[PDB]
Amino acid sequence: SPGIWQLDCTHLEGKVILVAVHVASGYIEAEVIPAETGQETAYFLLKLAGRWPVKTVHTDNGSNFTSTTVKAACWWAGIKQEDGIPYNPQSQGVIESMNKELKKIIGQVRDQAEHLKTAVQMAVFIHNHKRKGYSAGERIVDIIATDIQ
Amino acid sequence: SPGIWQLDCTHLEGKVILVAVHVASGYIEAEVIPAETGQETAYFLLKLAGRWPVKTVHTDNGSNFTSTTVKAACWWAGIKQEDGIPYNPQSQGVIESMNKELKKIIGQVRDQAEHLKTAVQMAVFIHNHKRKGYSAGERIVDIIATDIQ
Numbered sequence: 685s686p687g688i689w690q691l692d693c694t695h696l697e698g699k700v701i702l703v704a705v706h707v708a709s710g711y712i713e714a715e716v717i718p719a720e721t722g723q724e725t726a727y728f729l730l731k732l733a734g735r736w737p738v739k740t741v742h743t744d745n746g747s748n749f750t751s752t753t754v755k756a757a758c759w760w761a762g763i764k765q766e767d768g769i770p771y772n773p774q775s776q777g778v779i780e781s782m783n784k785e786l787k788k789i790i791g792q793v794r795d796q797a798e799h800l801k802t803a804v805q806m807a808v809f810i811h812n813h814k815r816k817g818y819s820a821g822e823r824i825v826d827i828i829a830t831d832i833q
Numbered sequence: 834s835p836g837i838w839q840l841d842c843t844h845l846e847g848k849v850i851l852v853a854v855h856v857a858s859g860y861i862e863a864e865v866i867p868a869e870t871g872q873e874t875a876y877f878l879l880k881l882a883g884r885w886p887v888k889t890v891h892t893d894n895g896s897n898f899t900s901t902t903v904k905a906a907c908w909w910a911g912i913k914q915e916d917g918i919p920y921n922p923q924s925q926g927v928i929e930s931m932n933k934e935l936k937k938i939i940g941q942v943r944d945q946a947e948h949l950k951t952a953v954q955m956a957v958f959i960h961n962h963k964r965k966g967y968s969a970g971e972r973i974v975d976i977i978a979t980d981i982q
């Protein structure tokens with residue numbers, strides 16, 4: 685559970701926002717890319733796993749599950765690559781709700797940046813710092829620290 | 834000190850590697866950029882502060898210290914921007930040592946990636962996971978968790 689992350693891809697402004705959610709905390713990392721390719725997804729996972737102890741990734745679609753570049757990055761970084769099949773039906777809804785929340789925040793900051801990627805990072809900042817009581821950023825740190833000890 | 838980060842800029846292959854070091858842990862984030870500008874530095878700090886509770890940044894040089902875009906990002910993200918003067922002289926050496934270690938790792942993985950940015954992220958991963966004992970990634974989590982609690 686401390687090491688489990690979920691990939692999520694959403695669209696805005698004719699661009700792609702790639703998101704990794706730390707399932708237990710709701711903490712996120714995200715990036716803007718022109719389109720979701722295996723190489724982009726692989727690179728994003730390499731970045732993520734250098735930053736947090738990523739043990740398992742539930743991929744966002746079967747193309748990234750299949751992608752040999754994504755598999756090579758998971759091998760490199762010591763990540764177990766799994767499917768994202770929502771055997772729990774509430775998984776679909778949680779991700780949907782997050783995409784809607786993120787897009788709403790992006791709208792609230794959109795005028796404060798020229799480039800979409802800036803607004804997305806502002807949205808990541810707000811999402812991770814929002815107290816719900818602890819923030820997602822606080823919850824991820826506590827979960828992993830508990831796990832280390 | 835859980836909140837204190839130091840910016841560091843180094844060169845390789847005609848490109849710039851921008852590094853943020855969490856001083857208390859030695860944990861790092863890094864990116865490759867064509868050249869160090871106020872705008873790239875501002876964007877890097879925005880990304881960083883969405884991911885970790887950044888209270889203070891010691892900037893790497895007087896141009897990023899002066900930069901109005903860097904100041905606007907520090908304002909946006911709630912970061913106190915400070916100068917990077919090594920009033921403690923052992924600070925110069927620690928960063929120089931880190932740049933040489935990072936470059937060493939980058940050369941050990943350089944053949945495993947076409948693009949420099951990939952090699953740099955592999956080096957970030959290795960650096961943060963290296964046990965010296967605890968790794969830098971373990972230390973940063975423990976430090977911040979203790980601070981929340």
Ligand SMILES: C[N@H+](Cc1ccccc1C(=O)NCC1CCCCC1)Cc1ccc2c(c1C(=O)O)OCO2
Pocket residue numbers: 723724726727730753756757760944945946947948949951952
């Ligand atoms: C396309 N190449 C192939 C390659 C080319 C040359 C040497 C080795 C390999 C190779 O397969 N290395 C194993 C891997 C190790 C970790 C992750 C993925 C693969 C890797 C790659 C993937 C994604 C990217 C890249 C790059 C890049 O080459 O820089 O740059 C930005 O997003």
Ligand SMILES: C[N@H+](Cc1ccccc1C(=O)NCC1CCCCC1)Cc1ccc2c(c1C(=O)O)OCO2
Pocket residue numbers: 795796797798799800802803872873875876879902905906909
């Ligand atoms: C240069 N612009 C000016 C701007 C343009 C339009 C609206 C507001 C502003 C504005 O100054 N907002 C205040 C901030 C300034 C810095 C950080 C947070 C808020 C911002 C910026 C900085 C660095 C970047 C960017 C961008 C971008 O516009 O996307 O893109 C990649 O690295």
